[PDB]
Amino acid sequence: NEEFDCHFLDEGFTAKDILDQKINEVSSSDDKDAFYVADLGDILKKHLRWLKALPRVTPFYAVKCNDSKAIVKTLAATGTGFDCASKTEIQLVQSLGVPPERIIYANPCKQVSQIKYAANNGVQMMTFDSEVELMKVARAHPKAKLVLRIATDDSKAVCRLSVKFGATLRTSRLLLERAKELNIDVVGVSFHVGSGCTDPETFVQAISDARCVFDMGAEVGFSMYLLDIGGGFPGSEDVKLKFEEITGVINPALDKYFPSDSGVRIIAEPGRYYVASAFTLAVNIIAKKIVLKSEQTFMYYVNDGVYGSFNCILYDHAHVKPLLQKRPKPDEKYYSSSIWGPTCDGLDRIVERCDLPEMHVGDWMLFENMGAYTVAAASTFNGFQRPTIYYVMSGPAWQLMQQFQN
Template identity: 55%
Template structure:
């Protein structure tokens, strides 16, 4: 069964059809045409599962999905149907989300440093909430979107996460008073505070520290007469159950901190900007081994068995760091390669180097996977490929990125429709 949401093809799977069945079908279709192109299969039901999990674990926090993480239209459409807000960082992201029917009040323009023309565009499309972290940004906003509702982003300069953002964005607490006074002089309206502890944060206390710091800045704004009613706790939430930090471990600290510093009776609207959390586990990548090289130490050893045990196999696959693996250097330990329709465990494993298809020597995907001796034409499946993959693809060296096929189980599709209907019902 197929469904179309504003031009996006999503296949609704019957109850006895699995994602694995879809992968089988796509590989067989390619083999029938003598093709071996890489492709993604996106299980949009995983988005639904993650959304329900979020609502259970963070009931006070409304998610505004970070579009940059995966901007494919079916993904944002499913999330929109479930009532999500959206964190946009550019004119084009705002256009994408507005054009699928999302109202401007469900968007936060969360890039602290924006082009003037993009600020004007946000105003023209009804986007009111903008983030800032410096004085020059305030002057740009005053000229191009004076009616904006502003959120002041603060830095979280604690011990660094895997990917730190506070080197690039965020005002220190000592700078916040001056920035608020500047906004007041420009007759701009500050409504809240935001932070981002960094992608894949593994130190749970960073969130609680940042929430406490946000309270300090909140009180500064209230003292200056601003109506402060929005707290944005950013992103950094784990996207896979194989992450070092489990989502529920994190929320077990966040919820008490919110209750202490921003109790529910104060009426503060709490939002977040998850990206990786929602989409990481939803995409599976199928790649083909297009070439290989076997390197042995036979020249330095007279023992054939010893040489066999120390050989390295280099595999070249038809996707690489200029494609789906572009932003995964910090997360390759979470990638789980499996051999299509075969099991690794009963085979001898070798030291392996895996390369992408381009002629660039930097197109090295990993040197840590242990793989058996595979043949040209074998398929590998890689899970947890939904975040910063399809949204960062390039065509470097003339190689197109993998095609994506979008599926959802009938049960998950029905759940989306129920959530949509409930959200549309009068309060």
């Protein structure tokens, strides 16, 4: 089974070269299903980079971003924590041998039976942001260590009047007092700035707000020690606001509001940072139409779409950039083109308009940075199966993973 099958990446070869090779091998096979190449070594590189940029912050990987068992196994060997949102994710993490103290149940609104599942399996730390959640915890997991999730302002959000998660400071005070009444232990504070962060100062504000709630806890008699700064960090360099800019703004704020001598323990919940760039998707052009506007335009149909990997266009506000597998000659002509998914849906369209050389059925298109919120949310609408994932890892990357295990 390919789930736990990993291939060697030879010296001097990158995931890109492996992609080229696999494509050339099937040139006349006629079996040209879409497929992923996933470089686990890129995940190890991301971990080293995190250790360098955020030395005070323990990463808890957000399983929901991509729950591939190979990914979770690699990260567990690396020694990260895991942020789990449901019973199934907890089951996945524990099946790989991760002890419960490396799991945070960071879902603020949890079904009671799933809270009980967490309690049965020793997962003690959970987040919350409402009084009803406190009632549920008191009845189903009374010895849990609760982390109060506070609200953060996203000025760019589509729905700004109705925020799904996060308590205001005013509500946070009442929640701390209520938890004290119910004899429930609150041990920290969490927040989530969001993937669509444009200004790193948002983090500063969140950290400042977190400190405020910490002070409230001290007033009510809690011994607060856990600060969870959430996720939202970029997973590729193809972004305006790069990881290191964010961390360069975060670390002084952490030192100012949560100095190390205070005894605070700082964690994060990065999802896309670890996995986005590790996965590259190859889709095959399965159909083609030429529309005359005599300026020629083209419609290409590929065998992955908005019901599959490209659901990220709708759910994750993703902007995907098609890349050519075979290097184009410098002089060849480009045409206005659209790219469509395989399903019956007229809205199953990947790219409305782009410039491409004339391509043919059987040619491949590549999409980089497809690791995050792509396969995790794919469906089998129309009966189309999920692309196979080929995991690769070089020898030196495996050695680095061994060093992390030691």
